[PDB]
Each structure stands twice: as structure tokens, then as C-alpha cells.
A paper describes a structure:
The most predominant and clinically important multidrug efflux system in [name] is the CmeABC (Campylobacter multidrug efflux) pump, a tripartite system that includes an inner membrane transporter ([name]), a periplasmic fusion protein (CmeA), and an outer membrane channel protein (CmeC). A recently identified [name] variant, termed resistance enhancing [name] (RE-[name]), can increase its multidrug efflux pump activity, likely by influencing antimicrobial recognition and extrusion. The cryo-EM images of RE-[name] without a bound ligand permitted us to resolve the structure of apo-RE-[name] at a nominal resolution of 3.08 Å. This multidrug efflux pump adopts the overall architecture of RND-type proteins and forms a homotrimer. Each protomer is folded into a transmembrane domain containing 12 transmembrane helices (TM1 to TM12) and a periplasmic domain that can be divided into six subdomains (PN1, PN2, PC1, PC2, DN, and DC).
We also incubated a 20 μM RE-[name]-nanodisc sample with 1 mM Ery for 2 h on ice to form the RE-[name]-Ery complex and determined this structure using single-particle cryo-EM. Again, Ery was only seen to bind within the “binding” protomer of RE-[name], whereas no Ery molecules were observed in the “access” and “extrusion” protomers. In the “binding” protomer of RE-[name]-Ery, Ery binds at a site that is distinct from, but partially overlaps with, the Cip binding site. Our cryo-EM structure of RE-[name]-Ery shows that the bound Ery molecule spans both the proximal and distal drug-binding sites. The amino acids within 4 Å of bound Ery include K89, I136, I178, I291, M570, I572, F610, L612, F613, T614, S615, F625, L662, and P663. Most of these 14 residues are hydrophobic in nature, underscoring that drug recognition is mainly governed by hydrophobic interactions. In addition to aromatic and hydrophobic residues, it was observed that some charged and polar residues, such as K89, T614, and S615, are involved in Ery binding.
Author numbering:
A (entry chain C): 546 to 941
B (entry chain C): 249 to 495
C (entry chain B): 100 to 297
D (entry chain C): 51 to 198
E (entry chain A): 100 to 149
F (entry chain B): 744 to 792
């Protein structure tokens, strides 16, 4: 039984083993703010280079979407490859991943993320924690980014956890419209009208519906793409000044280049920047949870509030009913065996029978190199049941 | 022809003069390509309380029927189909059941050295598996990969129960020459009746706490544990009642 | 109780249209509360360095939202209702002097203190494709009182702007000064919790 | 439509998040506000009936629909039970490239999807694309200035 | 019927984007109904003065 | 409603949340019964009534 403890300690613990799902998810991310046509050229080259290898049969792409963060960022495209078959293909999914990774490290023009599809849907992986740094002071997301980055820089040194990533990004370029209200009121304009003109020309303005094939379809107003592509597209836009005079839009408006976050995130009615991380090897998920909580408390104090989601929230709010139920089951088994044998002492033999089955299972799983799994525990359940059944008959 | 303004002349300024009108998409941010060819993916979420295999087959046939009427150059494909995984798992569970039954017949023909005895597992095991299916359906559980894995597990419980009952009958039959088959069976059943109930209750009490565990891992555990408990209880009842008579 | 609430909301949905614009703008809340106070929680500042309005705003931002997530709490509210709100205290003597009415103030605040929609610069369909796609971000909702007093109601015949500061006094005050919560001899916002039905 | 991420967050997510707060058995709330769109996922406690969660969310959002801006009110908020997995994905492609993506999407939406809804067991049928036929008026600023 | 109305309302909620704007402005109402006519009550003025 | 009562025009951003903007006259002017003698409303013409 001491060797059982040793073998349990040495064996790795993971939630679900990685399995080839017969397709390979490719995540392509161009630099932030890259145009869609560049992404289409990239994914065209991607599929062309993936065509040579015989293992993939077909390629499905979804240009203009980010699978990681549901969105329509034009700089991100997801291209799922379809493996030929499990039987007709000599290579496993991992070797295909390695070949595609090796083809694509050199160019560094289109970032490559080749990941096998999740065994089961909505499955948290490696028991990572989902921290939300709810800013409570109302600071700008740009300052939130620097504070959170200081938090990660502190957290990287911590031994409990490793591989921390933050979804919040502010690299995306964003023109900032600075409105000189004095000039716009001077020209006898209204902010609502000038912004309707902007939304009509640069943006898409949706006015009414027109029917085709019996279905009610939108009517959209936008300026020709030739004119709005340039940064100084305001000067061609003209707005009436309520005095029957054409006032140029660039007179009171100006585009200045700035960097802003493409996607914002609010957790529990409060602005936040989601932080993910995985426990370091040899450390439990909960230990990493308190470690990152302490890091957040040190870095951010009384201005950011910690939050938990998914697996981290389940661990934080866990009532520990599983261990209590296991203790109840152990007591019930003891009682039922004592009733069967008409003696309190003898069920001890039936209980001590199961360590042999547990020892065999853990020894073989250690030798095989397979890590502790959910399916391993499911098999251990039947193992304990059968060992107990054999012992009960021997004792009786 | 929408009239933006009316000039001093009878001629009217219209949208055609200042803008170009065409039927375009609402959004140009996205685009889908399959094999370097323009495509539109379609997603089909399975309705709750339905059969995946039948729905997938109906979808494929309906797609073929619609493809008969497709415009020239339009072709369909189904890259992802979770029905493949469940069909493979069902085939593998059937093969595992057949192999386990054949191995039971072989092992009992080897040790027990009797041919008429092989029939007893052949009836006892399928009855208990069918009962497990029925009680699983009553509880509302659904066939899935986890359930099929737990069925692979429960195969061992059922075959083992049949082995214990039949082997005890044979051992008592060979202990005494004077004893009759019915008397040997009743003696063995008297010996191991309360033990079998004890194993059934013990295994249920072992499996129950696993179901109480919360979380996604808790629910995954609950599936295996609950079908395992259902199977062991029904197999115990079958070995208690049907197996001795056939023995 | 849940089914009763769902039926009540289903029947109410039709009548919401006939309600006045202000009523629906504030919104109609349908809950399962019994309107019987389950308990009263009073948050009081011992050091008295925190004013009643700021205590109420702290509570409504931090405590009340978390309390409403607690199961079994049908509705939780604070007596004061002294939420943060820009108060434009108009002076009628100064309003009639400059010849601007309260309607001219409402229109100015509605038009200027708002955020509208601005499209991205480089977007398809474009025949001259730019290397990058740039979004446009604006801020039309003023944050500080100094920005609110600079709102231009009217432009004089010369290049002189009449502004809210001339005709009104702007400050950050409570939404309502109607109520007050007192604990013992101290000032504390009381949190009344109504038990959810069943 | 055509609103940057921050304004969408502040103007749309905040009222909806305020109104949705306090819904029965809600563990936490996650919302993202990408350019032009605002998705708000409202997670609930395990064992809660999904239809019940959906209808309560509907009621809470219908309470605060009026506070939303004019464009968001025009394009009403959609509430769905996101707890769904993908049975399969059917891709309709024009091999000869006779039709562009817009025509393919419109044909699929008008013809293919309705038959998919007819297939028993197909609870949800959707198309990834977002290209509905729309009447586009391409304004030319030079011509607009020429005609005043 | 209580859950049937819930399912119908949830589906209309999910498809709200597909609806035309007018029926979005005038909220669509989902209510349980019964085709059965339990009885017909007729109110009449005996004096015919009403 | 903008002078005697409180008129809620729209919301301003503060501390992440949205807080109302309310317009009202000073407490002194709406205090008396004869409050109406002080408020003036402009007609279709430029005259103040
Ligand atoms: C949107 C449109 C997409 O739907 C999703 O976003 C779903 C709901 C993802 O979960 C959503 C879940 C969500 C919303 O959770 C907050 C978010 O994380 C993203 C969008 O994935 C799932 C499971 C993806 O796994 C996800 O792949 C991502 C690259 C990373 C993500 N995880 C590591 C983070 C992982 O789970 C997965 C199985 O590959 C997608 C498969 C079904 C597809 O190929 C299909 C075509 C999708 O692209 C999609 C229907 O177009």
C-alpha cells in the first residue's frame, strides 16, 4: 500500500486524454488590424501548402472569424482540415500536427495554431483557472491592460502556476474622432446629424426593409469603398448646416491614429480582463487558484476585484460533498458486510481486498506511460466492485 | 428612381444620379471557402431526446434529394459528423459483447467440460443487458460514448455473476454423485443467495457516492456509476432467479 | 411561483406598449418578491469620513448587485435611492435673462451628451484595398461637470457661445433627495431584502 | 451597426447586464463587445431547466429593451439557449465558382435550411455566414457634392 | 401547455432577428388558447331601452 | 417637468456604470406656490411667455 501511494504520486493526473477527432483545427491570426484580403491570401496559401500531404482529404475554412474569441475580426481566420480516415491514414493526428507546425515556423507572416478538436464539447482542459480582474475604479481599458500586465509579470515568477495568458489586447489600431464642439455649434450643426452622415457614409446605415422572394430584407446605405478607404475620407463628406450651406466634415472633425481594444469584456456588470492559466507540474489546480488570487491581490488592491468562472468557479464554490458521500458509502458498505457476516470484525478483510486491485491498476498504468484519467477512475470503480465481490464470496 | 429633390425644371434629381444601387450582402466581414472554393457551412444541432444515427441518415438522404435540384456547380459535403464516433463506439461495444460471450462459452467448455452448460450464459447475459437497457430508458438516460464505455464495463459484471452461479451448481453436482441436478441447484442457491444480495447492495453503495460528486467530471462519473449500479443490480436479480432454473 | 411570474410577464408584455414613453424608458420590473421585509442591513460609516450619497453609491455598486445574485432574494433595495446623477440646477432668473428655455437645455443635453455609431475606415467592398482595417472610436458622453457646463445652448450673433454654466449650476448630486436612512444616531443606507416567493 | 467596441459595451451591455442581474440560479455573467456587436452569455447553476432560464432572461431583457439605443431597438435582441453541440456541418460549395458566396448563402437560407428544419431530430439548423440579400446604396461623395 | 408556451416563446426569442420591424415594434404575444366553447352567455335589455 | 420636477434626459458614464442626468430648477424658485411666474417658455415666435 505504500507502493500504491508512491505510484499514485509518480503518475501524472489529467482530466481527459487527447484523441484524434479526424479533423485538425487550424487557427490563423494575422497582425492586429490586418485587412481581410491579406487574410484570404494567407489562407489560400495555407490550403495550397496543405494540399500536397496525402493525409488530409479536404479543407474547410471560415475566413473573417476568431474561433478562440467568437468574433468577426478580419485579421483572424479558422481553417479546419479534414483528415482522410482513421483506417486509410498511416499517421496519427499528432504527426500531422508536427508536420504542419514545422512547415510554418519560418514564414512568421501568418501565425499558426494547429490544435486537435476538443475530445468532448465545452470541456475545460488541464483544469485551468479563469480569472476575471473586475476593475472597480472605472479606469480606461488601456490602463487596465498595463495593470494586468504587471499582474502577469509578477505571476510568472510564481512557482505554483505556469503559462498565463490574457485575452485582452489593445494593439488594434483605432482612429479617434476628436470633436471640436465650438466649431460644430458655430456652423449651426447638430451632433446627431453629423454622426448620421458619418454612419451613412463610412459606416452602414440601415433605414427600412424591402421585400424580395417574400422575405423582408434590409436596405443599407454606405459610401463607395473607394472614398472611405483613406484616412482623410472626412473631407469628401459634406453636411448641410441648417443655413443652406455645405459645411465640410473635416472642418470640425479630425482623425488621429490610436490603439484600442477590439473586443471589450464585462464580468458581473463590471469591466474585466479575463486571465487564463494552467497549474505548474506537481501542483493541484486549487493551489494555483489561491496562488493567482494572492498575486492579483498584491498587484491590484481595492481597485480590482477577483472573479472565477468555469472550473475555477466550481472549485471555489465546491461544497466538498463528494468526500462526504464517499465516507457515507464506505460506512454503508462496512455495515452491510457486517450484517451479511454477522460479525463486526470480518468486513475488514473485504475492505483490505481492494488495495490489490488498485495496486495492479496503478502499477500497469504507470508502466504503460498512461496518465491518471477519468476513464482510469471509472475502470477502478469496476475493479473495486469485482474485487469486493470475489472477497465477499471467499469470506462467506 | 427615388426622388431626392425636385429641380426648378420638371426634371427630378434621383438616387441613380448620385449613387449606385445593387443587391448586396448585409455584411462583408466574413467569407467561407472549402477546398479553395466558395462555400457556406451549415450547422445542425441535435434536438434533445432524439436519435443521432437516424437523424444523420435522414439529413444525408435529404441533402442528396436537394442536391438533385442544386444549381449547376453546387455540390454538398459533410466534413463533421459526430454520428461517426457513436457508430464506431456502438460497433465496438457489439464486438466486445460478442467476444466476451464467446470467451465465456469457451472458458466454461474448458473448465466445466460440458456442452449443454454453455447455453446458460447465452440466455442469462442478454436478458440482464436488456433489462439494463430498459431501466436505463426508464430513468431517462441517453445512449452516448460514456454510456457505451460503462456498458463495456457492465459486461464483466454480468458474465461474472453467471459464472459464479453456474460454477457453484457444477461444483455441488460433482461433490456428490447421489445429489440430483435440481437438488444441487437448490443447495448452491441456498448457499449463495444472501451473499449475492450482499454483493448487489455493496456495489450499489459503492457506486452511489460517485454519482453525488458535482462538476462536469462529477456528471461523467455519475453516468458510469449509475449504469454500472443498474447493471449489477439487474444481473444480481437475474443470477438469483433465472440462472438457477436454467442451470 | 416561477410559472405565475412567467404568465404575469407574458400578459404584461402587451400592455407595455400602451404605457407612456417615460414609464417604459425607466422600465417595468416584475419580480417574485412578497414585498415583506425579510431583513434590514444597514451600512454605516464609523469614521464619518464617507458622506451618505457616496455610501449609497458604494452600496448600489458593490453590495446590492452581489446580494441580488444570492438565491432566495426576490429583491434587494436601499431606502435612500440617492444614486449618482449629474444635476443641472437651472436658474430661472438667469434663464429668462439670456432668453433660453428649459427645452433648449433639454435639447442641448440630449443632442451633445450622447454616443453615436461610426463605421470602420477600410472596409469591403473596396477596389483600392488598404493594408489595414481601422476602426473609429468616439466619445460624446461627457464625464466631468466641467465638460457639462461647456455645452453650448446657443451661438450669439458674434463668435460668443452661450453655455450651461451661464444659465445653470452643474454638480454631481443624488438622483433623489426624497428619503434618508438612519441607524441609531448614525446615517446608514438600509438594505431591505424581500423574500422570493416559495 | 458601425459602433466601436467601447460605446457598444457602455450603451448596450450595461443596461442589459443591469436588467438581467438577479435572474434565478445565475452563477455568473460573461459579456464581450466586439465592433458592431455585443454578446452576453448568462451562465446558470447546474440542473436548472434551460427553457426556464431562457424565458426569465427574455422577461428581464424585455423589461429594459427601451433603454437601448435606437439601432439596437430596431435590431431586437435575440435570446437563445447556447447549450447545444454540433451534430454535423454541411458545406455547400460552388465548385465551378459560378456563384459567389452571397448567392450560395442566400440559396442555402431560402431552400436548404427549411428542409433541414423539416428533418425530425434537427432542433436547430443554422448557417455560419451572415450575408442576407440587402439593397445597398453606394453613395459617391463627389457626385453628392456635385449635385449638392 | 405551460411548458409548450415557454418553448414557443423561447423559439420566437431566438428567431427575433428574422422578424420584420413592425411586428418587433408591436410585441408578438404568445398565450395559451382553447378551441372549446364551454358556454355562450347572452345579455339583453328586456325594456329595449339600451 | 424640467423646472419644477426632475427630467431624465440621458445617461453619462461614471465608474463603468451609466448614471442618469437629471434637470431641475433651484430649490428656491420651485419652493413657493407662485413658481409659475418665474419660468418662461418661448413660443413659435421669439416672444417669451
Ligand atoms: C462561434 C462559431 C463557432 O462556434 C464556436 O465558437 C464553438 C461554440 C466553440 O466553442 C466556443 C466557446 C466560447 C464561446 O467560450 C467562451 C469561446 O471560447 C470560443 C468561441 O469557442 C467550439 C467549442 C470550438 O472549440 C473552441 O475552439 C476555439 C479555437 C478555442 C476554444 N477554447 C479553447 C477557448 C475551443 O473550445 C470548436 C469545437 O473548435 C468549434 C467547432 C464546432 C467548429 O469548427 C465550428 C465551425 C465553430 O468554428 C463555429 C460553429 O463556427
Amino acid at each position: 500500500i505504500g507502493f500504491i501511494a508512491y505510484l499514485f504520486k509518480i503518475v501524472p493526473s489529467s482530466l481527459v486524454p487527447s484523441e484524434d477527432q479526424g479533423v485538425i483545427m487550424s487557427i490563423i491570426n494575422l497582425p492586429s488590424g490586418s485587412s481581410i484580403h491579406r487574410t484570404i491570401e494567407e489562407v489560400d496559401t495555407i490550403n495550397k501548402n496543405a494540399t500536397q500531404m496525402k493525409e488530409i482529404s479536404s479543407s474547410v475554412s471560415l475566413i473573417g472569424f476568431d474561433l478562440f474569441t467568437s468574433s468577426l475580426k478580419e485579421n483572424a481566420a479558422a481553417v479546419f482540415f479534414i483528415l482522410k480516415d482513421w483506417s486509410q491514414r498511416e499517421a496519427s493526428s499528432d504527426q500531422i500536427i508536427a508536420q504542419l507546425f514545422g512547415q510554418y515556423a519560418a514564414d512568421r507572416n501568418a501565425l499558426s495554431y494547429f490544435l486537435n478538436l476538443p475530445p468532448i464539447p465545452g470541456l475545460s482542459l488541464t483544469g485551468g483557472f479563469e480569472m476575471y480582474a473586475q476593475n472597480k475604479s472605472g479606469k480606461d481599458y488601456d490602463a487596465i491592460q498595463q495593470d494586468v500586465n504587471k499582474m502577469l509579470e509578477l505571476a510568472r515568477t510564481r512557482k505554483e502556476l505556469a503559462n498565463v495568458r490574457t485575452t485582452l489586447d489593445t494593439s488594434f489600431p483605432q482612429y479617434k474622432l476628436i470633436i471640436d464642439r465650438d466649431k460644430m455649434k458655430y456652423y449651426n450643426l447638430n451632433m446627431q446629424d453629423v454622426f448620421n452622415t458619418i454612419s451613412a457614409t463610412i459606416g452602414t446605415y440601415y433605414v427600412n426593409d424591402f421585400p424580395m422572394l417574400g422575405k423582408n430584407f434590409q436596405v443599407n446605405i454606405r459610401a463607395l469603398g473607394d472614398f472611405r478607404n483613406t484616412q482623410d475620407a472626412l473631407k469628401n463628406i459634406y453636411i448641410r448646416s441648417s443655413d443652406n450651406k455645405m459645411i465640410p466634415l473635416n472642418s470640425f472633425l479630425t482623425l488621429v491614429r490610436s490603439a484600442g481594444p477590439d473586443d471589450v469584456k464585462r464580468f458581473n456588470l463590471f469591466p474585466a480582463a479575463l486571465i487564463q492559466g494552467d497549474p505548474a507540474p506537481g501542483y493541484t489546480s486549487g493551489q494555483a487558484i489561491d496562488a493567482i488570487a494572492e498575486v492579483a491581490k498584491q498587484s491590484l488592491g481595492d481597485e480590482y476585484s477577483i472573479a472565477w468562472s468555469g472550473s475555477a468557479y466550481q472549485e471555489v464554490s465546491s461544497k466538498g460533498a463528494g468526500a462526504y458521500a464517499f465516507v457515507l458509502g464506505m460506512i454503508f458498505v462496512f455495515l452491510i458486510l457486517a450484517a451479511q457476516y454477522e460479525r463486526w470484525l470480518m468486513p475488514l478483510a473485504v475492505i483490505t481486498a481492494v488495495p490489490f486491485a488498485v495496486f495492479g491498476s496503478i502499477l500497469l498504468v504507470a508502466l504503460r506511460g498512461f496518465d491518471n484519467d477519468i476513464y482510469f477512475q471509472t475502470g477502478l470503480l469496476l475493479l473495486i466492485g469485482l474485487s469486493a465481490k470475489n472477497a465477499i464470496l471467499i469470506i462467506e | 428612381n427615388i426622388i431626392l429633390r425636385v429641380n426648378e425644371d420638371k426634371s427630378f434629381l434621383r438616387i441613380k444620379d448620385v449613387a449606385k444601387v445593387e443587391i448586396g450582402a448585409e455584411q462583408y466581414n466574413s467569407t467561407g471557402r472549402l477546398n479553395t472554393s466558395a462555400a457556406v457551412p451549415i450547422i445542425i444541432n441535435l434536438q434533445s431526446g432524439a436519435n443521432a444515427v437516424n437523424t444523420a441518415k435522414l439529413i444525408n438522404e435529404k441533402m442528396q434529394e436537394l442536391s438533385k435540384n442544386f444549381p449547376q456547380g453546387l455540390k454538398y459535403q459533410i466534413p463533421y459528423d459526430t454520428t461517426i464516433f457513436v457508430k464506431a463506439s456502438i460497433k465496438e461495444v457489439i464486438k466486445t459483447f460478442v467476444e466476451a460471450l464467446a470467451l465465456v462459452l469457451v472458458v466454461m467448455y474448458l473448465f466445466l467440460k460440458n456442452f449443454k452448460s454453455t447455453i446458460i450464459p447465452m440466455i442469462a447475459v442478454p436478458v440482464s443487458l436488456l433489462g439494463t437497457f430498459a431501466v436505463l430508458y426508464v430513468l431517462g438516460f441517453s445512449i452516448n460514448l460514456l454510456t457505451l464505455f460503462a456498458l463495456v464495463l457492465a459486461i464483466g459484471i454480468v458474465v461474472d455473476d453467471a459464472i459464479i452461479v453456474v460454477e457453484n451448481i457444477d461444483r455441488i453436482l460433482h461433490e456428490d454423485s447421489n445429489i440430483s441436478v435440481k437438488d444441487a441447484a437448490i443447495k448452491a442457491m441456498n448457499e449463495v443467495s444472501s451473499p449475492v444480495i450482499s454483493i448487489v447492495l455493496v456495489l450499489c453503495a459503492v457506486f452511489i457516492p460517485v454519482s453525488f460528486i458535482s462538476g462536469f467530471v462529477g456528471e461523467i462519473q455519475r453516468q458510469f456509476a449509475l449504469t454500472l449500479a443498474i447493471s449489477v443490480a439487474i444481473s444480481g436479480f437475474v443470477a438469483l432467479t433465472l440462472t438457477p432454473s436454467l442451470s | 411561483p416561477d410559472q405565475a411570474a412567467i404568465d404575469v410577464n407574458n400578459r404584461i408584455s402587451a400592455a407595455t406598449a400602451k404605457l407612456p414613453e417615460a414609464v417604459k424608458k425607466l422600465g417595468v420590473t416584475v419580480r417574485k418578491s412578497s414585498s415583506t421585509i425579510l431583513e434590514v442591513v444597514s451600512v454605516y460609516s464609523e469614521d464619518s469620513s464617507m458622506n451618505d450619497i457616496d455610501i449609497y453609491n458604494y452600496v448600489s455598486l458593490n453590495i446590492l448587485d452581489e446580494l441580488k445574485r444570492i438565491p432566495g432574494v426576490g429583491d434587494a433595495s436601499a431606502i435612500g435611492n440617492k444614486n449618482y446623477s449629474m444635476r443641472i440646477w437651472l436658474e430661472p432668473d438667469l434663464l429668462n435673462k439670456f432668453g433660453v428655455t428649459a427645452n433648449d437645455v433639454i435639447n442641448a443635453v440630449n443632442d451633445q451628451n450622447a454616443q453615436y455609431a461610426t463605421g470602420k475606415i477600410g472596409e469591403e467592398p473596396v477596389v483600392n484595398k488598404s493594408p489595414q482595417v481601422i476602426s473609429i472610436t468616439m466619445q460624446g458622453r461627457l464625464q466631468t461637470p466641467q465638460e457639462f457646463e461647456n455645452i453650448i445652448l446657443r451661438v450669439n450673433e458674434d463668435k460668443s457661445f452661450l453655455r450651461i454654466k451661464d444659465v445653470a449650476k452643474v454638480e454631481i448630486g443624488a438622483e433623489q433627495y426624497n428619503s434618508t436612512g438612519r441607524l441609531n444616531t448614525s446615517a446608514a443606507v438600509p438594505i431591505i431584502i424581500n423574500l422570493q416567493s416559495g | 451597426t458601425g459602433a466601436d467596441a467601447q460605446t457598444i459595451a457602455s450603451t448596450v451591455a450595461t443596461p442589459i447586464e443591469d436588467a438581467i442581474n438577479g435572474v434565478d440560479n445565475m452563477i455568473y455573467m460573461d459579456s464581450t463587445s466586439s465592433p458592431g456587436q455585443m454578446k452576453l452569455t448568462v451562465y446558470f447553476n447546474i440542473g436548472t431547466d434551460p427553457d426556464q432560464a431562457a424565458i426569465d432572461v427574455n422577461n428581464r431583457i424585455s423589461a429594459a429593451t427601451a433603454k437601448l439605443p435606437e439601432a439596437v431597438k430596431k435590431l431586437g435582441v435575440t435570446v437563445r439557449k447556447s447549450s447545444s453541440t454540433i451534430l454535423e456541418v454541411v458545406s455547400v460549395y460552388s465548385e465551378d465558382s459560378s456563384m459567389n458566396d452571397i448567392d450560395i448563402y442566400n440559396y442555402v437560407s431560402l431552400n436548404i435550411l427549411d428542409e433541414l428544419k423539416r428533418i425530425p431530430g434537427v432542433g436547430d439548423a443554422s448557417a455560419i455566414g451572415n450575408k442576407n440579400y440587402s439593397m445597398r446604396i453606394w453613395l459617391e461623395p463627389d457626385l453628392l457634392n456635385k449635385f449638392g
